[PDB]
Structure formats: C-alpha cells, structure tokens
Amino acid sequence: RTFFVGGNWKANPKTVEEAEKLIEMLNGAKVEGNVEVVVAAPFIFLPTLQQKLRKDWKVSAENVFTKPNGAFTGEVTVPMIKSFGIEWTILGHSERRDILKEDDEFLAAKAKFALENGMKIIYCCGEHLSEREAGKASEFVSAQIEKMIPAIPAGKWDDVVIAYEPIWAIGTGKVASTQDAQEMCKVIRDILAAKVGADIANKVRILYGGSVKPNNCNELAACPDVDGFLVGGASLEPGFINIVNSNVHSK
Amino acid sequence: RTFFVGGNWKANPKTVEEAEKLIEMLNGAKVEGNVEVVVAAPFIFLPTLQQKLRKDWKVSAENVFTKPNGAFTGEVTVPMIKSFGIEWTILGHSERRDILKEDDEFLAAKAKFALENGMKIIYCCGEHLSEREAGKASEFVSAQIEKMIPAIPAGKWDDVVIAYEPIWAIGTGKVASTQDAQEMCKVIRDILAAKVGADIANKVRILYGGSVKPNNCNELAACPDVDGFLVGGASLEPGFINIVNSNVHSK
Ligand code: NA
Ligand code: NA
Ligand code: NA
Ligand code: NA
16 A cells, blocks of 8 residues: 555645745655655635645645535535546544534535545544543444445545544543554454455555654554554644655555 | 625536636626625635636635634635635525534624624524514524624624525525515614614615525615625626616615
C-alpha cells in the first residue's frame, strides 16, 4: 500500500493571503520516499489551492453534501468541487459528527454519493472516552465501519481511505500511545477482512488521525497497520513535511 | 428605505462554468429605479463571483460559522469571506434550520459574531404549517425575532436585513397570497417597533422570501411593508432582473 498523508487545515487559515503563503511553503518542500499527499482546505480556498498547489499532490474538500445541487442553502456539492478538478473529500470527521451532529446514516449517504460521482473519500471514525474506558472501543468502531461498508459501490474500494481518530484523547486529559494507534488500525483492517474480504483489507489505507507531530510521526509510521496520517494542526506548519517524509519508516 | 433584492442561488449551479455564464448575464442587465442588489452563492464559487460580478452589486455568503477559525472541519468563517472583500451573509435560512437543524441559539451567536466582525446579514425567519393553521404565526415569528434582537450589537442595525419565509407554503400544497406577505412583514416591523423602537423599525428592510417570480413581483413590491425580496430559483434565471426592477412599484 502506498503511504498516505492528508493535511486537514480544518477551518484555517483566516485569510486567502495566509493560504497562499502556506501553499508557497508546501510547493518548495523536498519529499523523500514514496507517499501520496492530499491537502484539505476550507471551501472558499479550494479554487486558490487547486490553481497554485504543486501538481504532484492533490486537493481535498473537508465535507460535501448528499445531493448534486438544489434547495440546500449553505451547502457545497460534489459536482461543484469536481468542476475545479478536485477529486477528494473528507467525510465523517469527529468535529462534524460531534459539533455539527452528522449521523451515520447521513455519512453513509455522502460516501455513496461521492463515490458514485467519481470522488475519492477519507472516511473518519473513532470512539469517545466512555467507550474506551468501558473496553468497548472495537465494538464502537466496528458499528461505524459496518454502517460505511454497504455505502461503498461495487468496484469503489480503490477510492476509499479510512482515518481513525482517538476522540477519547481530544481535550480529555488522556493521551494516546503509539501502540494504541497500531491496535486500532489493526482492528479496522480485521473488520474489513471479515466483512468484505482479505483483498480489500490488504489494499485499503488506514490512517492515524490523532495528534501527529514531527516528534512522533516516525514511530507511528513504523507501525505495520498504520498506512499514514490525517494531520491536524501540523498541516499549517513546516512540520507537515516531516510527517509526509515519515513514509520512509513504514515498511 | 432603499428597496433590497437578494438572489439566493442556494446549492446551485453544479459547475463553475455555469456560475460564470450566470454572472455574464447579470452583468449585462439593465437595472431601473433605485435598488440594492446582493447575490449569494455557494462558498466555492464566491471567489469567482467576487472577481467577476458587476461592482455596483455585492456578493454574499449563504452561511457562516460562529468562530473566526479553528477545529471546525468543513466550516467557512467570517474572516475567510472578508479576506476576498465579501461583506454579506445569509443566516437562518429555512433549509438550514430545518435540514441542517440550526437552532435559534446557534443563529443568534452567528448574527452577533458576523456583525461584530463587520459583516452585514440577511437574517431569515418564518413559521411552518401547523402554526399558520393554528392562527399562531405572529407568536412563532415573534419568538424568532426576539431571539435575534439581543444578538445585534450596539450600533449595528444599519447592517441587518430580515427576510420572512412562509415555510407553510413550501411543499405543503398551500400557496401564499400578496396579502399574506404584507401582513407578515408588517408583523415583523411592529415587533421591531415595540422591542427596539420606531427609528430602527423605520430603517430596517424586511424582505419577502416566499415564491417570487416575474409574474408576482410587481404586486408584492407595491405592498407598503415589503421592502424587497430574498429570491430563490428565479435568481438563476433572466427573470431575476424583472424582480430587481420591481422596485419601481414600491413607494
Ligand atoms: Na472489550
Ligand atoms: Na506503517
Ligand atoms: Na392568533
Ligand atoms: Na414595498
């Protein structure tokens, strides 16, 4: 599997000038090894990013709606994004599940619609502190992945990447270990193997989407079931390049 | 009060090429009378629209989040929009209240944040069929406006426009009359007068946001408390210009 690093800018930066400065820094970065890099930005910066970002990387949206167009004030749709040449979106990020109240049925509909219309997706999952403490993390994540699975159209698993977010380690006073990352990525791979088969399980990239920084990326990358990262705040910093380059530690 | 016409494209068109064609048609339109025109488009088309739209009109977003930036994957914020020179947003559109489940507390926070950061807002309200049939439309709309009022910072009423949406007439099998539009716009003006005073009530534009087309815009415009329109589907059509030009029938 090719190592995969997604930079999720989230709702940042504040201005188009700052976005352009960030792009200039990314464009001069020396990538080592073999890695697929995707950069996700706010909708209003996607045109800028598509025009100016180095063409060996790809641009991603941070969300999409479930329909092609229509009476959905405020929503951006798959055809609009595709009309700029953008091929990727994030779906189901913890912030959207938890703050914007996106449920599994809505997310499954987004995944199906995006894939059947020629997008590729970074589909996010992960458990909260209660389920982690109860020893039920794998049950919780399995339910999420089992809702995603029937949404994937026939022939579209090549266009799916899954990101695991240790939500129990966000703003809770608890920190995730390297071993926690490996264990949960392996749990997801085994669910795929059991539900859709070994061929698919062996090709799908499974990313760690917890806190990834230059000081932990190399050890995380070396974990056998960790195929890359969905990076948060370091995306906006020169340290993103260190994370991209951690691929050389992943066998 | 200057007559005000907002074109809400909603989640349309599907492609940037179609957006550019629509802009070209708007740029050649001959406006009659005196009218303030704003065009609201999907986030990803806002840069295009800001660059290319006739400078005597203004661009608007269709929504904004409550914070300047941060860990809000998928959201677009006020500073991002302002960094393109865009000064307007719609808030509280029925589609966002009803499909995206935006509540009055969230919307009040958006209105306060947008206004205190130098935006102007088109704040939407309106009752559903049950409240209309119960004879409680004015109570329902008053509760909505009373949640909006304390959000408006001192000195910012010049930057507020209110749109009334007869949600009871959307997809219900019932149609609104011209008299219904006038009556509800007057209800809103009287709430403003009673709660924040006659000076403010006399300056705030109150728009009709139900079905507005070339065949009904002139009679609606003539209603004394109707100060313009938040236009839906006709926004995407040459008939938008007829609606803009209905201002000559409003005294
Ligand atoms: Na257990
Ligand atoms: Na690895
Ligand atoms: Na009554
Ligand atoms: Na009028």
